[PDB]
C-alpha cells in the first residue's frame, strides 16, 4: 500500500470567508501569547537568522509589541552580549548603574562615556553617594585638578529620591530641577539606582512594547543540541534572556526532547520554546517534555531546501491546524514559522490556530536587520539569496498588522482568541488563487 | 553648403592620460568657485529640479561643501520660505531670535516650540531682557501661575556675554554654567543675539560647510524670465539667498541676457548665474551682461529630450571647453550642468574647464531629496518622467563622487582644482576603447 | 583649448594584414623575454590576483613555459611561503634535503612525511651520513625497535655519487640499483645533496618549463609601496623569488619610481618589474629607475572600473606601441597587462610591441586557480566582483591561446617573436569591420 496519511493544505489552497462584523479593523485587539508565560501585544516574532535578528532588530521588534530571537551562528559571549544589549536598552530603573569615585581621572570618564554611549555616572565612596557627573559636566576643563571631584555636581546639590518613591513623584522632581537623572538612595544615602528621563520618554513612545517586570525589553535567543549547548544556555540566561529557543530542523527527536527537558530542569525560571515540528504527535511530545511553546514548520521557509533535498515536509496550514488541535486545552502556544509571503498568509495562519507567526524574509533587508541586503538559509538544506532594502522595520510591521486587522474585521473577529477559533475557510483551486492576485492589468 | 561648425565630443569620447604624480588622492585640494564671489570646498551643485533640491537637500549639499539650487516649480512665498529654511538652519549667532513676554501663556509657548522646532526664547518685556525660557523649563507645571514668568530663568540668574566677546570665552562660560544658550547683550543689557551649543557643534561637525559671512549655510534659487520674475527675485533676496540662478532652456536670448543685467543692477549684493548655454559667443554675452557665473549644458541632461524634440545641442565635453576658452581671464566661472553618469565623467568635465558640476539624476532618490519612496525623477515638452533607485544618504553618493575625482587628480598629478582644469590631457577614443574601459566579458556578482 | 594628445586605439580597432609566408604555425618560435634577465618559452604571464595566481597556478604556468606572479592580498610570511612552494616544487638537485637521525621515532617521521609530501630522508647523526629511509621503508613494522635505525637502509648499502658526476652516469646507477634517490657526497662522504627520479622525469615531461640556474621553476611576486613593502621584498627574495613586481594602479609616481630604484639597489640579484603605466614618459622614468621590465595597462582590465570611476586610461593597443617606441634600444621588455579577451587580441598586442602578455580573467576558473567551484573573479573602489565559468585545466586554455598566436604568426610570415613584434602591419577598421570579423548572421550550435 502507498501509505498516505492525509491531503495537506498550504496558504494558497484556502481563503477566509467574510462574516458578519460589528468591530472595525482599527478597534480589534491583537494581543496574544508567545509562550505560557510571555504575552505579546502583536503576534509577530523575528526569526533566529544571521541576516535577520541581532540586538538592533530585536530591540525594534520588542518596541513594536512583538519579539526577536537572536540567532546562534556566533560565539557564546557574542550571543550573550547581543541579549545584554536588548535587556539594557531601557528599564524602569537602572539598578546597577556604572559608577565612578571622586579620585577617578576625568580622562577615564571621557573614555567610559565613549565606550558606553552614555555620560551619566553617579559618584560613590564605598557605596555612599557623594556626587554625580554627566555629559554637560564633562565639557568643563577645570581650573585645577584632573579628577571627577573637580567637575562633578557635589553632594550638597544632589537631587535624590528614596527607594520606593512613585515614578510620577520622581518625574515632578526631575522637571522642577531641570535635570534628566534621578538618583535613588536608601535611608543612609547609599546609592540604590538611577532613573533617566530617556527611559521615561521611551516608555511613553512605545506603550505597546514587550517588557518584563523590570521594564526591560523582552528578547529570545536560539540554541541547538551540540556540545556547547549547555554552556551557551547558561550564558544566555545569565545575560537576562526571556526565552530560550531550542531550534533544530527536527524537533520530534530524542536530542531535542532531551535538551528541552534539560533546560526546564536546570533553568526553571526561563521560558523554553521547542521546534521545529509539523505533527500532532510531535506537539504532544514537546509539551510533555515541558516546552512553554512549540514552533511549527518543516519545509515552508522561503529559502528552505528541506522539502527538495530530503523530500520531507508538511504544508503549513494543515501543520498548524494539526498542532493546534493536539494542544487544545493544554495552555501551550504554537508559533507558525515559515512560508509567510503576504499579510494575507499571516491572517490565514492565525485562523488555522497559530498564536503568533515567525518571519525571516519579510524582515531581512530592513534598516535594523544585520548587514539589496543578504538573506541566506542557516543550513545543505538552505540557499543564499538577495532581498531588496526595505527601510525601517516599523513600516513593514504596520502593513502586516494592517492586513491582519482587515482580516479580523472581514471575519467579525474582535480579538485573537476569536480569530483563532471562529472564522472559516473555503478551499479553492489553482484558478481561485489566480483570481485573487492582480490579474489582466499592467501594474 | 552643409554648415558644420565643428566635430563635438562628449564624455565617452575621451579619457584622461595618466601623468607623473607626487600627491596622493587623499591629499589633493578640491576647493573651487561657484561664482565670482562664492567659493565651494567641493565642486558639486545640486540641480534646480522638484525631484532633487528643496531645503532639506540644499542643507545637506552645503554641509558637504557644495550648494543646492532650490527649484522654482512652486509659489513665490513658498520658494522664499525654502531659502529661509536653509539660511536659518545654522548661524554663528542668532541676531533676531524669537522672543516672548513674561505674560505669555505656557500652553501657547509649548505649541510655538512645536511649530518652530526649537524651545529657547529670550524673555523681553517692553524693551528689557528679563529672563530666558527653554525646553527644560517648559516641562515644569508651576505650583501657581500659567505664564512664562512662572518657569523662566529670571534676570538675576541670566548668563550673558557682551557683544564682541570672542567665541572661545563665550564657550567657556557656557560650559562652566552647564547651559547651551548664551545671551549676547550690549553695554545697557539690551538683547543683541543668541548663541547656541547646537550651532557651535554643527560648525565643528561640518568644517567644510559652505557658509556666508554670518556663518549661515549658502543656498541658491532658480528664477525664469516670466512676468512674476521681478517679485520672485525680490522675495528670494529678502529671504537671504546667496545666488540667483536665471535658469532657462536657452540663455543666449534677449530674455535671459536682460534679466541677468537687471538682477546685477537692481540687487548688486547678490550673486547671479545665467544659463543654460553651450557656445563661446553665449558665454561672452552673459559675462558682458554681468553674470557672476554661467551654466553650460544644452541637451545632455539625463531626462532631457531637447536634442530629440528640437534637434538642438552641443556634446558636453566640447561645450565646456569652448565656454572655458571664451571666459579665460575674465574671472567668470562656468558650471557644467548635465550628462554626468559616473564619477569619471565629473573628472573629465573638470579637465575640460568646468569650475564645478551640477547634477540632478544622481541626487534624485536620496533620503534628502523631495518625494516619497524607487523615487520619482522627471524633467522640468522637452523632458520625460521616470524612476531612479532609492539611494540612501546623500553623503555616501558625494563621498564616491569625490573619491573618483580625487583618484583622477592623483592619476594626472593635479594637486588642486586649478591644476586639474588647466594641465592634464585627454586621448580621443573609439567605441571599442569605451567598451574596453567598461567592465567587459565577465559575469558581475 | 580642449587638450587632446592623440586618438588612441584598442584591440577591436585593428586587424593584422596577412603577408607572404614560408613558415607554418607549428614551426614558429614563441620564445621571448619577461625581463632583462628572464626568458620565457611562451609569452604568457598570469596576473597577481587572489582569484588567479597562488603557488598551484604559478607552478602550472612555469611548466607551460610562462610564469605566474603571486598576489599580495595575504600576510608577508604567507606570500613568501607560496613562493617557496613554487621554488621547491622541482629542482636539478635538492641541496638542503630534510634529514633525520637514527634515533628519530618512526611514528614521528610518518607524520612529517604526511606534512612534507615526500617520504625520502637521508639519515645523519652528528655530521655523518649513516643511512637513508624512504616511503617503502616506512611501511615496515620492525621486529624490534621503533626508530629510523630499525628500518633505514644502512651506510654499507647506500648508493652514492660524487659531486660533479654527470647526470647521465647518476641515472645509470639509479636504474641499475632499482632506486629512485641518489645521495650526492663529497670526497669525505659528507652529504651535499639528493637527486630524485621524480625531478628527472618532471624535467623530461615539461622540457619547455621556465626554470632558473638550479633547475627550479621560476616565479614572481607582487609588492606595493606601503609601509611593509621593504620587509615583504626581503622575505620574498629570501624565499627565492625570481622577479619582484612593484605593482600599483599608477606606476608613473614618486612612490613606485623610488621603490623600484630601492629594490634594484638593495637586491641587485633579483629582477624587478614596475607598473602599471601607459605612456612613453612613464616607461622612460621606470627604465631610468632601473626597472628590468615595465607593465603596461591603465584601464583595460576585464574587472577594471578605473576608466569609469576616475575617467582615466589609454586604449591598450596605442599604450603598448607608445611604450614600445619609448623603450626601443634600451633592452627593457614591456608586459601587456589587461584587456585580452580572445587569442586574437594577444597576437595584436605582440605586433604592437609587447614582449609578453599578462592575463587574469582568462585564467580565473581553471582547476589550478585559487577558490572553490563557476569560479569567483574579482578586482583587487576601482574594481568589481564577478563570476567566470569553470574552465578545467590551465593547459587547455594555454594551448588554444598559443595556437591562435601561432596561426597569426603564420598568417603574417613571422618566424619568431622578434619578427612578430617588428614587421607585421595593421589595418584600421570601423565597427562594421569588427562585426564582419565576429561570427554573424548564423545560429551557433
Ligand atoms: N540628580 C541630580 N542632582 C543634582 N544635579 C544633577 C542631577 N542629575 C544631573 N545633574 C546635573 O545637572 C546638569 C545636567 O545634567 P543632566 O543629566 O540633566 O543632562 P546631561 O545629560 O548632562 O545634558 P544633555 O542631555 O543636554 O546632553 C549637570 O551639571 C549634572 O551634574
Ligand atoms: N543664558 C542662560 N542664562 C541662565 N540660564 C539659562 C541660560 N540658558 C539656559 N538657561 C537655563 O538652563 C536650563 C537648561 O537650559 P538649556 O538651554 O541649557 O537646555 P534645554 O534646551 O532646556 O535642554 P535640552 O537641550 O537638554 O533639551 C533651563 O532652566 C534654562 O532656563
Ligand atoms: N641511494 C640509495 N641507496 C641505497 N638504498 C636506497 C637509496 N635510495 C632508496 N633506497 C632504498 O630502496 C628502497 C626503495 O626506495 P625508493 O626511494 O627507490 O622508493 P620509495 O619512494 O621508497 O617507493 P615508491 O616511490 O614506490 O613509493 C628503500 O628500501 C630505500 O631505503
Ligand atoms: N547612566 C546610565 N545609563 C544606563 C546604564 N545602563 C543602561 N543605561 C541606559 O542608557 C540610557 C542613558 O540615556 P541618557 O540618560 O539620556 O544618557 P546621557 O544623558 O547621555 O548620559 C538610558 O536608557 C539608561 O537606561 C548605566 O549604567 N548608566
Ligand atoms: N533659539 C532660537 N534658535 C533658532 C532661531 N532661529 C534659528 N534657530 C536655530 O535653531 C537651533 C536650535 O537648536 P537648540 O538651541 O539646540 O534648540 P533647543 O535647545 O531645543 O531650543 C539652532 O541651530 C539655532 O541657530 C531662534 O529664533 N531662536
Ligand atoms: N626528499 C626530498 N624531496 C624534496 C625536498 N624538498 C623538495 N623535494 C621534492 O619533493 C619531490 C619528492 O619526490 P619523490 O622523490 O618521488 O618523493 P618520495 O619518493 O615520496 O619521497 C621531489 O620533486 C623533490 O625535488 C626534501 O627536502 N627532500
Ligand atoms: O536553511 C535553512 N534550512 C531550513 N529551514 C530554514 C533555513 N533557514 C531558515 N529556515 C527556516 O525558515 C524560516 C524563515 O522563513 P521565511 O519567513 O519564509 O523566510 C526560519 O524561521 C526557519 O524556521
Ligand atoms: O526637461 C528638461 N529639458 C531639458 N533639460 C532639462 C530638463 N529638466 C532638467 N534638465 C537639465 O538636466 C540637468 C540634470 O541632468 P542630469 O544630472 O543628467 O540628471 C538639470 O540640471 C537641467 O539643466
Ligand atoms: O580592480 C582593479 N582596478 C584596476 N585594474 C585591475 C584591478 N584588478 C586587476 N586589475 C588589472 O586587470 C588585469 C587583469 O585583466 P583581465 O586579463 O582583462 O582580466 C590585472 O593583471 C591588473 O593589471
Ligand atoms: K484580485
Ligand atoms: K575595464
Ligand atoms: K567572421
Ligand atoms: Mg543627557
Ligand atoms: Mg536644548
Ligand atoms: Mg617514492
Residue numbers in the entry:
A (entry chain B): 1 to 371, 381 to 388, 416 to 479
B (entry chain A), C (entry chain A): 1 to 373, 381 to 387, 416 to 480
What do the authors report?
After multiple cocrystallization trials, we were able to obtain the structure of PaIMPDH bound to both ATP and GDP at 1.65 Å resolution. The two monomers in the asymmetric unit (AU) contained well‐defined electron density in the Bateman domain that could be unequivocally attributed to ATP and GDP bound to the canonical Sites 1 and 2, respectively, as well as a magnesium atom coordinated by their β‐ and γ‐phosphates. The binding modes of ATP and GDP in the canonical sites are identical to those observed in the structures of eukaryotic IMPDHs, 6 , 13 , 14 , 34 where the nucleotide's phosphate groups position close together at the interface of two opposing Bateman domains. The recognition of the adenine ring of ATP bound to the canonical Site 1 (ATP1) was mainly due to hydrogen bonds from the backbone carbonyl atoms of residues V159 and K181 and N6 nitrogen atom of the adenine. Additionally, ATP1 γ‐phosphate coordinated a Magnesium atom, together with the β‐phosphate of GDP bound to the canonical Site 2 (GDP2) and the carboxylic acid in the side chain of residue E180. In the canonical Site 2, GDP2 guanine ring was sandwiched between the hydrophobic side chains of residues F118 and V94, with the hydroxyls of the ribose moiety tightly coordinated to the carboxylic acid of the absolutely conserved residue D199. 35 The negative charge of GDP2 phosphate groups was counteracted by the basic side chains of residues K181 and R198, as well as a Magnesium atom. Monomers in the AU are related by noncrystallographic symmetry axes that allow to reconstruct IMPDH octamers within the crystal lattice. These octamers are assembled as dimers of tetramers that pile up tail‐to‐tail, forcing the finger domains of opposing tetramers to interact and placing their catalytic sites close together to inhibit the catalytic activity. Remarkably, no electron density surrounding the area corresponding to the eukaryotic noncanonical Site 3 is observed in the inhibited PaIMPDH structure, suggesting that, in contrast to eukaryotic IMPDHs, the occupancy of the canonical Site 2 by GTP/GDP (when ATP is bound at the canonical Site 1) is necessary and sufficient to induce compact octamers and, subsequently, inhibit the activity of PaIMPDH and EcIMPDH.
IMP dehydrogenase (IMPDH) catalyzes the first step in the guanine nucleotide de novo biosynthetic pathway, at the bifurcation of the guanine and adenine routes, which share the precursor IMP. An IMPDH monomer consists of a catalytic TIM barrel (light blue) and a regulatory Bateman domain (dark blue), which is not required for catalytic activity but is essential for allosteric regulation. The basic units of IMPDH are tetramers that dimerize to form octamers upon nucleotide binding. In contrast to the eukaryotic enzymes, bacterial IMPDHs only contains two canonical allosteric binding sites in their Bateman domains.
